[PDB]
Amino acid sequence: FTVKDCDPNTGEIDEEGYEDEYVLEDLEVTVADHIQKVMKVNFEAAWDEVGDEFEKEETFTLSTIKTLEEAVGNIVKFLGMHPCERSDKVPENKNTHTLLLAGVFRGGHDILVRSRLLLLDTVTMQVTARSSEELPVDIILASVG
């Protein structure tokens, strides 16, 4: 900006004044500015289907902590989607969990996620992102973080 001084009493607004620039804050763009979180038009089918065309994967095996919760903090909250297919709920503890989760991404097509968190007693887990849009499968796996 070109920075101009004020008199608030009665001012002056004149062509001159000199610039300095100040660095502003980052904008990060989310996976929730774009999405409508949903319930499926056809989960059974869709669920699978989305796999069919779309599916990328990441696996981790969890050996120092046996808790979802960290993961959980990043996922419900980052994606802004619904955990489910009756596979959401956990009390202050729970043995196993799946979020098979929903919403639709911008540009029309959908971004779909299944997270099977598996507890043997370590957690090893299958995160699936399946999508009706290509950019989202790679994204979900990242974005969730």
């Binding site: 000199y18 300095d20 620039e21 660095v23």
Partner: protein, 101 residues
């Protein structure tokens, strides 16, 4: 020295003169001239602290200065002319990053 630190826009804001009030900081200038030859300043004080310093150090982005004097540290929010913060020292490091100390 006085206590001053310069924003790379081009304002070395110092304070005081030698024992004058701190009331005097500023300098964005406005003009250009030859290497050997000499230059003009702007005029618009801010400040009129009390504590008498001997350090000025800019924030790592010039920005937040922490100034120590009388043995305590006033940090200023500078443009703000706000006290960014204060306490008593002994010795210092900014976490260079520009976010801790």
């Amino acid at each position: 020295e006085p206590a001053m630190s310069m924003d790379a826009n081009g304002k070395i804001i110092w304070a005081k003169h030698s024992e004058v009030q701190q009331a005097n900081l500023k300098a964005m200038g406005d003009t250009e001239i030859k290497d050997g030859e000499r230059l003009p300043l702007a005029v618009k004080d801010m400040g009129s602290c009390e504590i008498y310093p001997q350090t000025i150090q800019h924030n790592p982005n010039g920005r937040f200065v922490v100034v120590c004097g009388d043995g305590e540290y006033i940090i200023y929010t500078a443009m703000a002319l706000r006290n960014k913060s204060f306490g008593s020292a002994q010795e210092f490091a900014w976490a260079h990053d520009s976010s801790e100390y």
